[PDB]
Amino acid sequence: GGLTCASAPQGTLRILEGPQQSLSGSPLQPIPASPPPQIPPGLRPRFCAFG
C-alpha cells in the first residue's frame, strides 16, 4: 500500500512564454544628423570706410 518507483519518464517538456520580433525600421533620430550652421539671408555689410 506504499508508494513505489514507476517507469522512467520517456520525455521532458519545458514551457516558457515568449513574444516575437517586429520589422526593422531603425528610426534613428526625431530631427536627425548634425544639422549644419548656415548663412543668414542677405545679411548686408554693417560697416563702411571713411570718405
Binding site: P37, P40, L43, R46, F47, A49, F50
Partner: protein, 63 residues
C-alpha cells in the same frame, strides 16, 4: 589665457598711439605673437577669431 590652452603673462602695456591701427580706424587691445600656433596647433583660435569678428559685425552669435 584663451579658451584653447594659450596661456601667457602680460609683458607690456603698449601705449595706445604706438599700436598698429587698421584701415578702419580700429586698434587692437591684445597683441598675440604668431609663433604659438606652429608647434601647438591650436587651429581653434584662428577660427574663433573669425567667428567672433563675424558675430560682432552681423550682431549674430555663432556656435
Amino acid at each position: 589665457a584663451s579658451r584653447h590652452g594659450q596661456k601667457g603673462i602680460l609683458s607690456r602695456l603698449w601705449p595706445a598711439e604706438d599700436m598698429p591701427f587698421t584701415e578702419s580706424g580700429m586698434v587692437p587691445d591684445i597683441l598675440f605673437n604668431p609663433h604659438g600656433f606652429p608647434s601647438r596647433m591650436t587651429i581653434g583660435m584662428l577660427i574663433e577669431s573669425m567667428a567672433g569678428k563675424s558675430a560682432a559685425l552681423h550682431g549674430l552669435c555663432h556656435d
